[PDB]
Design a protein around this ligand. Sequence first.
Ligand SMILES: CC(=O)c1cccc(Oc2ncccn2)c1
Length: 100
Amino acid sequence: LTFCEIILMEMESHDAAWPFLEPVNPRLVSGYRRIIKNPMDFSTMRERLLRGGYTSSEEFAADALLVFDNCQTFNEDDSEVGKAGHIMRRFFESRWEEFY
Ligand SMILES: CC(=O)c1cccc(Oc2ncccn2)c1
């Protein structure tokens, strides 16, 4: 769980992290509520991590991947949020696998 802190810290402070720092506001984003069944973001993962809610590295990575799955589900690959999400998804997968 120490690497979960390191990678979440580094994801939070990443340049392309801006679309995933706080939860998507469905009032502002038209169609998000309907399309994304299980929304997830870095503050929600932060909140759960500081509360000790993650039992293992697998549960953490599950929510991490859910962010980028939702991103790709809702956003086009060439959109501004999508382009950012690919940078974060690749960053996460890369860092995650050099420690595991
Ligand atoms: C993540 C995602 O799919 C999305 C979708 C639309 C807008 C958007 O912007 C935004 N959300 C939250 C915080 C800052 N920015 C993000």
